[PDB]
Write a protein that binds this ligand. Structure first.
Ligand SMILES: *[C@@H]1O[C@H](CO[C@@H]2O[C@@H](C)[C@@H](O)[C@@H](O)[C@@H]2O)[C@@H](O[C@@H]2O[C@H](CO)[C@@H](O)[C@H](O)[C@H]2NC(C)=O)[C@H](O)[C@H]1NC(C)=O
Ligand SMILES: *[C@@H]1O[C@H](CO)[C@@H](O)[C@H](O)[C@H]1NC(C)=O
Ligand SMILES: *[C@@H]1O[C@H](CO)[C@@H](O)[C@H](O)[C@H]1NC(C)=O
Lengths: 108, 420
């Protein structure tokens, strides 16, 4: 499974939505500006060295998903199970978590 | 016993004491519309308040004990630029001798400096990782006592926070002029608010300071979460002191729908600066005047008013069916015209029977002036449902600890910075 993993190094995104399901991916060096993520399922997807600015995450369910070395600015996490253990060595600024889904405190 | 007392007057500031201290004000000093006696100082050069004292009252002695008091409001610090940025707000220091109050990240500091440049500092420290803070962006009564023979002490809302001996200090001089401006702040968008500055030529004890706190507290007028005046026709988010991780919510409209405490509250984070709990969650509670003949939109004690509820940006009314099972009976939000004869009248209550100041509590009363009782919450099958009961009144009569009869009103303020 780990061999089959796809990598996308670097991508810049402007105003656009994103409802989808991804499996076994790594997005690296992303720069998303004012992008809304509604109704997406993540299975073993990692975002590394990414920058989210004025982003919006809604109805997000994630298994084995991490945000490492990421920076969030003015982003809102509404109705997401993205708990604090899925932001590994990240930096959030002026970010809000609202209506968090019920889940285990750690990875299951 | 007061030497300087800056108080608002007709489009100016004057001194209550019989000394006639000269006052000059910059062109960028602002005043709140409702409570003009509170003063806003922004981070600029022209935002200056200069007060000049009389040569007969300039502090130039070495055994002279003295005290100060004021009310201060410090917005939230939002970014790392505020860290390690000790900035001054009041100076009476000349020739590197005097007394100064300054502000740092979660700190308020008193500093004394004698002619020998000996520095004594007393600090009050409040965190910013807390879920709900009693200090961030809220009014704080700061008073400072200086006994040259024993110690110098800091009091926050009348309680002791810190004390430090000053017997080692020698002769302390003071400036003829005393200063109000933000000095040494790198942040270009950082302001403070100040209220009621008083100076005394003696060390004040706990009793006198508590008396001063109570006198200046305006216990006969209701206050919001930020310590300002409660106003009618303004939308307020609701907080229960005893259960502060839930917010007021509705499920269904009308009598068959119940308003409850839903949770948990969300968070606002900035990694290493602040990790507070969201205060703009739930349903707003507008207050509508019913019988208060006062012209002002300010809410006073014992006022009889009504409470609107904002559900899907539509305004409903608090009411409950007086005739139902038990005392802890369910409140509801209903169509404004369809209230009929349901109990909707609420009495605003700030200070107790003896006049001791406490938080905002609402007492539902009927058309006949019979007390349904204080508004609070009770758990029915694991749901924290809103109820008005006389059980709170019974515990008040028994001088017992009431549970849930205390509410807190949170308007949207620029000093908190949360995204609605
Ligand atoms: C973090 O936010 C505060 C408050 O801004 C509000 O909240 C933001 C999330 C966003 O929704 C804004 O539109 C809101 O106004 C910022 O502090 C204020 O910034 C504004 C600039 O828009 C300025 O007018 C105020 O004077 C600022 N207040 C203070 C006391 O500085 C703050 O800048 C944000 N953090 C960062 C790093 O930018
Ligand atoms: C998400 O939007 C795309 C078009 O932007 C659409 O093809 C897709 O069906 C949408 N998903 C759902 C669940 O509607
Ligand atoms: C990601 O973090 C690394 C070190 O952890 C740092 O060198 C890099 O600059 C970061 N990426 C961006 C876009 O800043």
């Amino acid at each position: 499974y780990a061999s089959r993993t796809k990598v996308f190094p670097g991508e810049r995104v402007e105003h656009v939505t994103f409802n989808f399901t991804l499996e076994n991916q790594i997005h690296r060096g992303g720069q998303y500006f004012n992008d809304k993520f509604i109704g997406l399922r993540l299975k073993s997807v990692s975002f590394e060295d990414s920058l989210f600015e004025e982003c919006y995450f809604e109805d997000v369910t994630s298994s084995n998903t991490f945000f490492r070395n990421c920076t969030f600015i003015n982003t809102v996490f509404y109705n997401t199970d993205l708990f604090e253990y899925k932001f590994v060595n990240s930096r959030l600024i002026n970010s809000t978590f609202l209506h968090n889904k019920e889940g285990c405190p750690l990875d299951v | 016993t007061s030497i300087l007392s800056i108080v608002y007057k007709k489009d100016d500031l004057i001194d209550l004491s019989r000394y006639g201290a000269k006052i000059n004000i910059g062109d960028r000093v602002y005043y709140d519309s409702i409570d003009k006696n509170q003063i806003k100082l922004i981070n600029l050069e022209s935002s200056t308040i200069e007060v000049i004292l009389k040569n007969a009252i300039v502090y130039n002695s070495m055994y002279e004990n003295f005290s100060t008091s004021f009310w201060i409001k410090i917005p939230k610090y939002f970014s790392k630029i505020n860290l390690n940025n000790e900035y001054t707000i009041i100076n009476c220091i000349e020739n590197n001798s005097g007394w100064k109050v300054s502000l740092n990240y979660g700190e308020i500091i008193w500093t004394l400096q004698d002619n020998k440049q000996n520095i004594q500092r007393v600090v009050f420290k409040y965190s910013q990782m807390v879920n709900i803070s009693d200090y961030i962006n809220r009014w704080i009564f700061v008073t400072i006592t200086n006994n040259r023979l024993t110690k110098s002490k800091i009091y926050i809302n009348g309680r002791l926070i810190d004390q430090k001996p000053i017997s080692n200090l020698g002769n302390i001089h003071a400036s003829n002029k005393i200063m109000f401006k933000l000095d040494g702040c790198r942040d270009p968008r950082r302001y403070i608010m100040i209220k009621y500055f008083n100076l005394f030529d003696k060390e004040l004890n706990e009793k006198e300071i508590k008396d001063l706190y109570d006198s200046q507290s305006n216990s006969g007028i209701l206050k919001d979460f930020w310590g300002n005046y409660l106003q009618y026709d303004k939308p307020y988010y609701m907080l229960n002191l005893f259960d502060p991780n839930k917010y007021v919510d509705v499920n269904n409209i009308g009598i068959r729908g119940y308003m409850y405490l839903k949770g948990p509250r969300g968070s606002v984070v900035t990694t290493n600066i602040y990790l507070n709990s969201t205060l703009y969650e739930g349903t707003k509670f507008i207050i509508k005047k019913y019988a208060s003949g006062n012209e002002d939109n300010i809410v006073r004690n014992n006022d009889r008013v009504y409470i609107n509820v904002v559900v899907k940006n539509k305004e409903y009314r608090l009411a409950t069916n007086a005739s139902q099972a038990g005392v802890e009976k369910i409140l509801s939000a209903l169509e404004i015209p369809d209230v009929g004869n349901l109990s909707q009248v609420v009495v605003m209550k700030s200070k107790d029977d003896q006049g001791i100041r406490n938080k905002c509590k609402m007492n539902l009363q009927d058309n006949n002036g019979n007390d349904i009782g204080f508004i609070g919450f009770h758990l029915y099958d694991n749901i924290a449902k809103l109820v008005a009961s006389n059980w709170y009144n019974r515990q008040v009569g028994k001088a017992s600890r009431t549970f849930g009869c205390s509410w807190e009103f949170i308007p949207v303020d620029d000093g908190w910075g949360e995204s609605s």
